[PDB]
């Protein structure tokens, strides 16, 4: 699909057997979700945005289906005003900017 | 051009006669820069991101050339960790996400 930018580029994902929506975010290196629950071990991490830093759990090799495309990568779980898919997953689906 | 997401989608801009780099950010509604000197009147605004919220100046109708494409629109000036081109300007240059 081609997605224009007149509205926020939001897509439906499935992760951990649950359905969420999330913003395709070229401004984000990493993928950050809240209130998903992933199984197993994680590592504590801190991520930074516009107004400061937050603590997140880092999970590796998490299966995520992103607008009907199956991918595996790192998923960070923590406080965020909104769910974000970052470049680490976007490259996996072959997502580009075009102008 | 087409820009893949294996690294940060950073472009060169000219704004108010100064040259800057900025990150093409589908996750930002608005365009936020630091250390730019815009002329004239402006209104205080607060923007939010991950980590919390930042006080900014809002300037309307600011010419800005973004990868050699001339557009006009709202530019926010305030403490950001990186300069961001938002969707408000990206739609003006015809920028889309493709996968």
């Amino acid at each position: 699909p081609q997605i224009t930018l007149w509205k926020r580029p939001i897509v439906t994902i499935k992760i951990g057997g649950q359905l969420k929506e999330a913003l395709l975010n070229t401004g984000a290196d990493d993928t950050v979700l809240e209130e998903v629950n992933l199984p197993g071990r994680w590592k504590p991490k801190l991520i930074g945005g516009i107004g400061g830093f937050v603590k997140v759990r880092q999970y590796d090799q998490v299966p995520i289906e992103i607008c009907g495309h199956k991918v595996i990568g790192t998923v960070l779980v923590g406080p965020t005003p909104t769910n974000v898919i970052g470049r680490n997953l976007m490259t996996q689906i072959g997502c580009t900017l075009n102008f | 051009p087409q820009i893949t997401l294996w690294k940060r989608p950073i472009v060169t801009i000219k704004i108010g006669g100064q040259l800057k780099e900025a990150l093409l950010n589908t996750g930002a509604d608005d365009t936020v820069l630091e250390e730019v000197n815009l002329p004239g009147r402006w209104k205080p605004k607060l923007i939010g991101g991950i980590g919390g919220f930042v006080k900014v100046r809002q300037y309307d109708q600011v010419p800005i050339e973004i990868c050699g494409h001339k557009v006009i629109g709202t530019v926010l000036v305030g403490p950001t960790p990186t300069n961001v081109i938002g969707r408000n300007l990206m739609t003006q240059i015809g920028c889309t996400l493709n996968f």
């Binding site: 926020r8 975010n25 984000a28 290196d29 991520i47 930074g48 830093f53 909104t82 | 996750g27 509604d29």
Partner: peptide, 6 residues
């Protein structure tokens, strides 16, 4: 409004 690194 304006979305991350480190």
């Amino acid at each position: 409004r304006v979305x991350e690194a480190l």
